[PDB]
Structure formats: C-alpha cells, structure tokens
C-alpha cells in the first residue's frame, strides 16, 4: 500500500 | 560570449546535476534505512533498462517480473496522460503540467512509508507511444537477475524520469540533436574546436547517441559514487566520416558545419533541429 502526498491523501494498495 | 544563454542547456552538470547512464545522485530514508534514488533534473530521452521479460512489466508479486509498479486500486500505474490530468483535475498546480513533469510528480506522489512522511520518491518512465506514465517500483538501473541501462530502438519513445525533473525542462534541458552544428569552446571572440576528443566509430546518429550515453555521467561503476553530472556527456557526430567525437567538458558555443550533428546523453537519439 502507498499513501498519496498531495491533498487530498488516500491509501492505494 | 553571445552563446551563453543558448548554451546554458548543455551545461549538463548545472541543469541535470546527476548521473545519466545510472542516475543515483541522492539518498532517501524509508523507516530507518537510507536508499539510493535518481535525482536528475532533466529527462533522459530514449533511456530504458535491458534485462538479460521487459522492465516496464509490473513487479513480481513468481520470481520474474519487471521494474514497474504492481497493479493498484485505483490503477495509478500505468496511467495515461489524460488519466493523470483527470486524476489531478482539482489540483491547479499539477493538472496542467507537461506530460514528463506530470509523470514525475505523479510518481513522486506515492509515499511508501504509510505511517510517516518520508522523502523517497520513485523514478518513472513516460512512453510517448502509448502516452502512458509508468511508475518504477525498482529504482535500480544496473546490476552485473542481471540488467543494464541503454539507449535502444525499442526504447526510443521511452523517457527516464527522476523525482527532480523540472517543470521547465523544455527550456533548460536538451532534447533535439543540432543538425549542421558542432559543439565548440568560445575563446577570444571565436568558437574553437574541442581540443581533445575521443573518437568512436558510429554508423549513424543513433549509435553515436548510444555511445555517448554509455560513457556519460554515471553514479555507479561498471556520496563517493556520485558523478553530480560530471562525465562524457557530449558528442560531435561527423555523419560523413562516421565518427562519434566524444568529450567530457561542457561546450560554450556552436560551429556551423554541415558534416556534424551535436548530441548529448540526455538528447533524443533521433530528433534533430
């Protein structure tokens, strides 16, 4: 999983 | 020197500032461990990775995958240009970026440290053919599972992008080869030849560009290892004698010569202007 840095942030697996 | 402004983009040490063949000019920490990662500010046109089954395939989740990101939900890699612009349609600071910078920023948007804000940002490859941005999960570029970086006919539409690719690369970075032009050094109001060059035979401009890339700035043999953009980054190609004249000092002017095409390791292996 990754987390976006720019807003708005989300988890992407 | 009236060439100063024009020749600024060929100061690869200043505008790119990192390795070209192998770009690993910075370090980033991911949860208590430092890693090496690309940091060149210019895009590398035509660069790809040759695996001794293609490096743009997703990472294996068997034993033989590629360098690219594994499948995601939502699918953020690979992602088309239109797919990216739509993804960032609310971000005015991103949605209108050029395809290369956007691809770089898109890749740099993915934080592996899901519990902290790390500085690790993945490299990327933009394929002009499919107009697809590929986030590279593996930042490694050469290991001799053996592989190596190269310019190749298969890679001509690929573009290797680090996290630091500037949004104005079109203005400050090389891309096109200079036809009927020869890299020179400005001295006493006149553009003189590069005094010492290393002559490599090459059948066409492509092979010359390929050779320059092979000999260019590299952050890995075969800090300490960092080139910071220093290396054999330039080449004067004499299309008539079929000589790729390679050198490692920055050019500061152009010479008009219909027999020559000026190329760099960052430049596209085909495009001329």
Q: Is B112 on the interface with A (CB under 8 A)?
A: yes
Method used to solve the structure: X-ray
Q: E strands of B128-233, at which residues?
A: 132-135, 147-151, 159-161, 178-187, 190-193, 198-201
Cα–Cα distance, B161 to B97 (Å, whole number):
14
Inter-chain residue contact B114 with A6, CB threshold 8 Å: no
Of the residues B30, B58, B111, B115, the best mutation for testing chain A's interface (the one with the most A CB atoms within 10 Å of its CB) is: B111
- Kindly give the residue spans of alpha helices, DSSP state H, lying in chain B: 12-15, 81-87, 99-107, 169-172, 205-215
Beta-sheet strand order (sheet of B110-111): A11-12, A2-4, B110-111
The answer to whether B21 touches B217, Cβ cutoff 8 Å, is yes
For A11, which residue in chain B has the nearest alpha carbon? B114
Inter-chain residue contact B111 with A11, CB threshold 8 Å: no
Among candidate residues B230, B251, B243, B220, the one with its CA nearest the CA of residue B13: B230
Kind of pairing, strands B234-238 and B243-247? antiparallel
Return the residue matching tokens 């573009």. B159
- Buried b / exposed e across B85-110, counting CB within 10 Å, b at 16+? bebbeebeebeebbbbbbbbbbbbbb
Residues 6+ apart with CB under 8 A from B129: B157
Inter-chain residue contact B74 with A12, CB threshold 8 Å: yes
Q: Is B92 on the interface with A (CB under 8 A)?
A: no
Count interface pairs A-B at CB distance under 8 A: 31
The DSSP result for B68-104, as a single string, is BPPP-SS--SSEEHHHHHHHTTT-TTTTTS-HHHHHH
Residues of A whose CB is below 8 A from B68 = none
Q: Which CATH architecture has domain B2-10+176-216+232-273?
A: 3-Layer(bba) Sandwich (3.50)
Residues of A whose CB is below 8 A from B112 = 2
* Least CB–CB distance from A6: residue in B73, B74, B109: B109
**Domain ranges in chain B?**
2-10+176-216+232-273, 11-175
Q: Is B118 on the interface with A (CB under 8 A)?
A: no
- Kindly give the residue spans of alpha helices, DSSP state H, lying in chain A: none
Inter-chain residue contact A12 with B91, CB threshold 8 Å: no
Inter-chain residue contact A6 with B117, CB threshold 8 Å: no
């Amino acid at each position: 999983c990754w987390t976006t840095r720019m807003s708005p942030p989300q988890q992407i697996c | 020197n009236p060439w100063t402004e024009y020749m600024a983009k060929y100061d690869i040490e200043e505008v790119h500032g990192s390795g070209i063949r192998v770009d690993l000019g910075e370090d980033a920490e991911v949860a208590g461990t430092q890693y090496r990662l690309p940091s060149g500010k210019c895009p590398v046109f035509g660069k790809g990775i040759i695996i001794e089954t293609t490096f743009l395939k997703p990472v294996a989740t068997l034993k033989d995958g590629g360098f690219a990101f594994p499948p995601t939900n939502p699918l953020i890699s690979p992602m088309t240009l239109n797919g990216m612009r739509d993804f960032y349609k609310n971000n005015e600071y991103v949605k209108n970026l050029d395809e290369l910078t956007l691809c770089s920023r898109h890749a740099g948007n993915m934080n592996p440290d899901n519990d902290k804000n790390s500085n690790y940002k993945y490299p990327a490859v933009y394929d002009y053919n499919d107009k697809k941005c590929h986030i590279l999960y593996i930042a490694a570029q050469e290991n001799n599972f053996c592989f190596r970086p190269a310019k190749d006919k298969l890679f001509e539409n690929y573009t290797y992008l680090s996290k630091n690719v500037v949004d104005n690369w079109e203005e400050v970075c090389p891309r096109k080869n200079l036809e009927n032009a020869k890299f020179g050094l400005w001295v006493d109001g006149n553009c003189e030849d590069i005094p010492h060059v290393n002559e490599f035979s090459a059948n066409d401009l492509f092979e010359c560009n390929k050779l320059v890339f092979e000999l260019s700035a590299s952050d890995q043999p075969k800090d300490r290892y960092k080139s910071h953009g220093k290396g054999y980054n330039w080449g004067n190609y004499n299309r008539e004698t079929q000589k790729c004249e390679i050198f490692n000092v920055k050019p500061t002017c152009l010479i008009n010569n219909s027999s020559y095409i000026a190329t760099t390791a960052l430049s596209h292996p085909i495009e001329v202007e």
